[PDB]
Amino acid sequence: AECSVDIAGNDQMQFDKKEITVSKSCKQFTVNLKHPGKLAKNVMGHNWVLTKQADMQGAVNDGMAAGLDNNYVKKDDARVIAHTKVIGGGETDSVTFDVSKLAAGQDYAYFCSFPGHFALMKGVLKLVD
């Protein structure tokens, strides 16, 4: 038989092979692991979502619940001033919004609403002048 196997991480963050067979006729067995480094949008996507600081947590929670189909943002969510699409690796998206939706001395947060990402992918947006 063969005394080696090629196994890889896939774009779903699983092994491509759920089974390895080792023949008793093999003295030694060689496992070659590859990490292609490519993840599909459904497991590793990003967006950019803008809210008042106080509205972040509610918007993120309802955003996770809204699903990939809604770019992990609740449809017509009043707390969301602007958001991009959820994009995968090598992709781009742009969003334009009215600056009149911002007020001076208010705290604004941006985050990714892709489930679990708000913890790591956050920042502050400030109105200036």
Place this chain on the structure above:
Amino acid sequence: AECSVDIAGNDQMQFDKKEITVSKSCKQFTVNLKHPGKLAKNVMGHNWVLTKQADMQGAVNDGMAAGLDNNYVKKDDARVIAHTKVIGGGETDSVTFDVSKLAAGQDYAYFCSFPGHFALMKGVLKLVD
């Protein structure tokens, strides 16, 4: 100032910018999001670890505790028949082991011991012939 900003996911799964400035002299503001799709080994690495089925949970718990410098495998862990290094995107690693370490009528499992991967990155290794 400008009425647009370029923001990107980075290899730590954070935004490259933690702060965005919008001048109130802008009528509209544009955010251009990029997803380069590249993650560093310290946040998205894989390995391949072989144990008896019954030893998986213990080996993975002690493995996560052992850290990246020990390839997320407890040094000299008796339950671990064989393991690769932890590798990052675009990388490869191999391990060879003696087939004499496997016995008939034992159940063998493999997994990735990179923290959080264990639930999705699993398979069965079967002695055959």
